[PDB]
Design a protein around this ligand. Structure first.
Ligand SMILES: OC[C@H]1O[C@@H](O)[C@H](O)[C@@H](O)[C@@H]1O
Ligand SMILES: OC[C@H]1O[C@@H](O)[C@H](O)[C@@H](O)[C@@H]1O
Lengths: 822, 822
């Protein structure tokens, strides 16, 4: 069973029923203002920060799900329906929802009236525009009233949902029926005090009426599906005082057969300078100038269409950096459109706001934003350069860091814990990737404060040395890095020992002492320590580089000596010094993360893919045999069936979910990449397909979530719900798969001085072409691929054969033709 | 005009319609387990802590309000309806909700089936029991299937609403269709790990079938009001795995004409010792002994009836301490039933969990629980004793205190602020009222820690001296006490100067320095300073008592010299030493708190009610002229129309709401008592009537909220919603009005050495009889009352006239007959 289809030419996913297994959403906007838009028009908008500047209210875990969004009630001769289907659920003759790049279009038709809404966030605007086209599709004239509807939230979503004792008395609006381009409603809660910002909701016509009070619009004892006002057929002209402000206009339209009318609605976010806050000397009336300017920019359909065409050109431009043409259209749509689009969204949202993340506790993750950069750097490197500075600024002088920062303020906080010892290294990961991509070595000289302290700036490079040294000076008795609160796995809490309910493993106090070490961090360190060494040698820091390589060698020696179980890598040593992830325990025998990552670091790699004796092969075969399911690879096996007090959160999940035997998808690309490292492209591609949206569209009823984006987790073999995903959209899986497919499968990756072309995808993709713009030159890379295990590529460049797989960077403006034979 | 009526003989409020202005609730339970129950079965239940151990989920700000609670869907011939009206909203032939003392009955009849549900929490039990009675009222045999419905919360309410990324994978249940007494469902989320507790939802019958998974029971795209399972007339026998666990059983009923059946449903909270959590060695099956025992205790109608009678007897015995028989039945029902019931609820809940307080951030307020004692000490003094020790234990060594504590742990926290300088004196208030009531002088020698520090214990009396000394040593330039974060008005934040949005004033960092002083804390110091000196005298501390009265005197002199504005008392001095609440300012010229409280402390009292020269009289007259309204006295006049950065949170509310021009009811009884102190009984009683539930029942459509309990705030004169209440049930208004009316109007009040009988209620209650049990003896107080302004009482006791108005305490077991003439 499927619920829609990809449309590669329009770069859309087309949903053909409202009856999906779950609400399927798109993200609007890519700059500073964002909207979550479901296929039923549900969701909300915020400016910069989903907790602190949320414009409109949304209910997570509503009954039913997703009843709450931007609605347009049509009253046609007393019959009331919404083209989004929800909330009225009147029978529709046609329904369709198209999610595209930065816009969606939702169409519903019933009894000869077709209503189509195009939704998007324009470039350079802090606003969500809707363009509504109403068409008479019957053979008689029609007269209908359209009631727009949005529910405001009081800015601070946390306060909005818990602090009624205060907030039910503060709701404030103004109403401007006869504005310069049509009618507007102004939501200005707290603008009388410290807020310099307000929201507008307006339409490009003089409305017949309005409502700004939820209770009046909907009616006592009514859900949104039963709203009184649209049923009555006329606006109640309600002016809110406290309670629940809304934005709503009514417009009556008369249409002859085949005739249509357009309407443009804007929900905008505005700020004024402090001394330009008020229209009047008494400071009672809001200064509407920036709201009138905004409404003036979307007063016509023409203005809307121009914006939508610009947004398209922005996306075409964005997608011109990496693309592929092959015999596999699933592969292609993922690589050309969707995985890149998703990577923009994760770069913007980190893990804060989705239909699973609530946009309250989580801000921008230190580890999360660094990893996202890996799939984002080729898109817009100037924005990646900024993000690195923002991130490194939340670093402490001892090289440890705040685990996340608040998007509005860019200041770090401990709301989801502190002292994750894998954090510091991801910074090196992010800078290495950015430099390989852009060649912008000057970033290493950027002055960057610790903990945003004015006057504490040092060069970025120095933050990396802090990161590196943090791990050097925090190893345990085996030479492996101390784990601290948790490593890459948030639920491996080895310093916790909590027997007190209700307090979060993420924020709860940890024990000083013990000897808990992480095999994962060991690998991470070998990988990014080597990169650090490379940056040091290039800054001209010979002793530093030398010293750095001595430490890397030591730590990799320790992985081989103390971090190997026999058929796989060990996961860790607990508080007590006992091994975690050994065949000597009955549960949690093998954990996936060090298998993927130690192999990417090159640890235990042998002569080739057929070297059954190499540790890397052995590890990967164990991952194949014990962790493999048709939905991907589970995190560990077997899952823990009882609470293991020494391991923290991990065994708190029922088997087969999240970190206790779920397919935690973001560690899957590591095994994929590893598999290419040992020369088993076939298997790597196999693993790629198990978790990839386009190959799972065909089991939409099982996956349940959006079929065009990666999800955080898919229930494992031990779950009753095996195969069903949770937490879609916001996940490091997106950037990690992008890195996997674009760089190791298809094999095109930037290095410092050239572009590496090293295909390893197996025989399912026998021929394909990649166009990669790197350092202002275009590389047209034509691959003939036999997929033979261990077969690695040879190159010709502009007709001459070359040595190895690195193509030195041509000058800006050239086109370089690479012919690849595997 | 009205939506129901009082039933005095029954001690119930009878709601005669589903269509009330807002949801109107009762609180079930008075010990450690509590239920919020709207007159449509909405709300939820918790054990000890509304945030930490919430059994069942409830959505604030739902659309519509209060779609969600304890539902019984009846399916008769495919017609589906609920006796609570919501969620299904089927037309009922008959509907009625009776809210009583610790129980409620809700009845709905439709097409020949009457369904009545009695809800209560039994004494000694952590459970909510429902006894369902279905009656066939038609002339022919009838059949139906009943579906019970409750929605589980995942225990931590904060987590339940914000952390779906984790918690959608942790919901776990057990199904027990053939238990010892009928069918039961177990909610056991996190029992796997740190929780030693689970919930049960069971019925005294072998159910036809069950459901535990919300989406299956309700169906996709459906609201509660459209649940699929009841509509199909058959349970789906769903076994939840994550997502949203519910409890539901189906039961088939057959009824001859006139015949009824009882079903008993139980929602229970159960714990096991750690060593007996599990029924099996594998640890997958919860040990059910306690649940089987609880279900056995309510297996029959008889067991239910006996518990309901024990509950009635408990309430009769609680209400036997203070009673009045008078010419005014509204005054009688308030004093005899409702205001005492409300005091029980506030003692138990503080301000944490109502239909407006969301039972997340607020625990047990230091100041609020001290004031709640004033209204509660006469009901159950033993628990008042315990409360004082729990409270005093969260005090610091310098005499300042944690502003609130967490109900589950009894540990103080700062989640809603620090350093409110009025806090320490409330401790003296609470103890004095406890000692006056009980005569338990030995509580002062109770050893009490600071901040629960093992080894830090001092006698309770030392805590009081720490409080007393905190004020003496924290005065400013005018001799008035420094205000700190705020005083009793939380919105008066004179050390704030916040220009930054999104941070609670309550919680935001305060400024060092400045000279901000409170006139309210001065009048509070004067009153309770004097009470402390008296406690010191009794203990033999003549040195301490004399110094103490000296300070009280210094402060009293300071208020007359530096806190008097001309026609009323001054409110404060701001950070820079500018007066607040002076007639020299255009806004907030007069504030109510110091007016009632200074006069309660006897500041500015003259020769009598007609001593026009006296500050107290000038102050009270100005309160009357400038703050008075048909709905009560507003906090200050005029309201602030613009943000006053130096006053903090107060000017942030729009005019006429909450602290900015609202009737903040809990400060009205001070003015009442003040009016009695000064001899203006008529005026005092007037004010009493303006804010009292019984006297406002006639305007239910205007008050909106429950007509049988006090609310926090009634929208004031300057607000478009003037007369509309918010924040019902949980307010110090209840303790303070009970004080006012029981002790100062009717005039019956315990002193240290005898019972004072000092009526001051004016001419509208010419005669009444108070029955007061004090110190083991019963006082029968027969009052004949001219009401003459200023006229005070003379007494005769057991046939003999006496001097003054204090009847020294007679022995336990006596009945003393006091004849009173005013
Ligand atoms: O923290 C609780 C306090 O919050 C303020 O926002 C309200 O105005 C007060 O009435 C309340 O006591
Ligand atoms: O704080 C965020 C973390 O919460 C944990 O409870 C989850 O299992 C993790 O997957 C998540 O990253």
């Amino acid at each position: 069973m499927r619920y829609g289809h990809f449309d590669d030419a329009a770069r859309e996913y087309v949903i053909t029923t409202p009856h999906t297994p779950y609400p399927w959403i798109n993200y609007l906007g890519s700059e500073q203002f964002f909207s979550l838009l479901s296929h039923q028009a549900g969701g909300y908008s915020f400016y910069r920060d989903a907790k602190m500047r949320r414009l409109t209210r949304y209910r997570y875990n509503n009954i039913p799900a997703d009843a709450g969004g931007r609605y347009l009630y049509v009253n046609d001769g007393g019959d009331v329906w919404t083209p989004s289907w929800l909330p009225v659920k009147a029978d529709l003759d046609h329904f369709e929802a198209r999610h595209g790049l930065g816009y969606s279009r939702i169409t519903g038709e019933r009894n000869g009236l077709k209503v189509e809404t195009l939704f998007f966030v324009p470039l350079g605007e802090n606003a969500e525009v809707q363009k509504v086209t109403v068409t008479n599709t019957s053979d008689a004239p029609k007269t209908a009233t359209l009631f727009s509807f949005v529910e405001f939230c009081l800015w601070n979503a946390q306060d909005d949902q818990t602090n009624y004792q205060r907030n039910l008395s503060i709701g404030e609006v103004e109403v401007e029926q006869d504005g310069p381009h049509g009618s507007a409603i102004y939501h200005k809660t707290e603008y009388r005090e410290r807020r310099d910002h307000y929201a507008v909701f307006g339409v490009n016509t003089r409305a017949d009426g309005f409502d700004t009070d939820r209770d009046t619009f909907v009616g006592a004892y009514n859900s949104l599906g039963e709203a009184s006002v649209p049923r009555a057929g006329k606006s109640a002209d309600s002016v809110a005082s406290g309670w629940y402000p809304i934005g709503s206009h009514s417009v009556a339209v008369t249409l002859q057969p085949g005739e249509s009318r357009d309407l443009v609605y804007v929900l905008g976010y505005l700020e004024n300078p402090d001394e330009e806050k008020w229209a009047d000397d008494a400071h009672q009336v809001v200064n509407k100038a920036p709201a009138h300017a905004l409404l003036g920019r979307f007063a016509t359909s023409e203005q809307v269409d121009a914006a939508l065409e610009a947004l398209n050109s922005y996306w075409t431009n964005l997608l011109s950096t990496y693309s592929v043409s092959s015999t596999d259209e699933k592969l292609d749509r993922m690589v050309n459109i969707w995985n890149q689009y998703q990577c923009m969204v994760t770069f913007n949202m980190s893990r804060s706001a989705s239909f699973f993340e609530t946009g309250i506790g989580r801000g921008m993750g230190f580890r999360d934003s660094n990893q996202d950069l890996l799939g984002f750097v080729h898109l817009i490197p100037e924005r990646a350069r900024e993000r690195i500075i923002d991130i490194a600024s939340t670093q402490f002088a001892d090289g440890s860091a705040y685990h996340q920062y608040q998007p509005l303020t860019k200041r770090g906080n401990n709301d989801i814990g502190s002292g994750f010892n894998d954090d510091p290294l991801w910074l090196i990961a992010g800078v290495a990737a950015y430099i390989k991509e852009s060649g912008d070595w000057g970033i290493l000289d950027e002055p960057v404060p610790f903990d945003n302290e004015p006057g504490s700036e040092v060069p970025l490079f120095e933050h990396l040395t802090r990161s590196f040294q943090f791990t050097v000076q925090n190893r345990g008795p085996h030479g492996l890095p101390l784990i601290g609160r948790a490593d890459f796995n948030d639920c491996l809490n080895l310093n916790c020992f909590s027997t007190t309910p209700g307090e979060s493993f993420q924020t709860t106090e940890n024990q000083a002492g013990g000897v808990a070490e992480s095999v994962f961090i060991a690998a991470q360190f070998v990988l990014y320590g080597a990169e650090y060494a490379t940056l040091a040698e290039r800054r001209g820091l010979a002793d530093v580089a030398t010293e750095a390589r001595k430490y890397v060698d030591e730590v990799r020696a320790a992985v081989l000596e103390h971090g190997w179980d026999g058929q796989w890598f060990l996961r860790a040593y607990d508080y007590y010094g006992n091994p975690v992830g050994t065949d000597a325990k009955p549960e949690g025998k093998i954990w996936i993360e060090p298998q993927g990552f130690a192999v990417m670091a090159g640890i235990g790699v042998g002569e080739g893919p057929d070297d059954a004796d190499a540790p890397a092969v052995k590890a990967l075969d164990s991952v194949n045999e014990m962790l493999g399911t048709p939905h991907g690879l589970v995190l560990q096996y077997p899952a823990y069936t009882t609470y293991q007090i020494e391991l923290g959160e991990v065994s708190t999940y029922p088997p087969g979910y999240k970190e206790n035997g779920g397919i935690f998808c973001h560690n899957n690309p590591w095994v994929i990449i590893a598999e290419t490292v040992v020369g088993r492209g076939a298997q790597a591609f196999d693993y790629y397909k198990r978790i990839t949206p386009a190959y799972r569209e065909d089991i939409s009823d099982t996956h349940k979530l959006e079929p065009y984006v990666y999800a955080q987790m898919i229930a494992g073999k031990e779950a009753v719900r095996a195969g069903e995903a949770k937490n879609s959209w916001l996940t490091g899986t997106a950037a990690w798969n992008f890195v996997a497919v674009s760089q190791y499968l298809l094999g095109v990756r930037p290095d410092y001085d050239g572009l590496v072309v090293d295909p390893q995808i197996g025989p399912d993709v026998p021929s394909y072409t990649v166009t990669r713009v790197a350092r202002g030159a275009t590389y047209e890379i034509t691959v003939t691929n036999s997929g033979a295990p261990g077969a690695r590529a040879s190159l010709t460049v502009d007709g001459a054969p070359v040595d190895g797989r690195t193509v030195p960077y041509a000058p800006a403006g050239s086109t370089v033709r690479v012919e690849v034979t595997v």
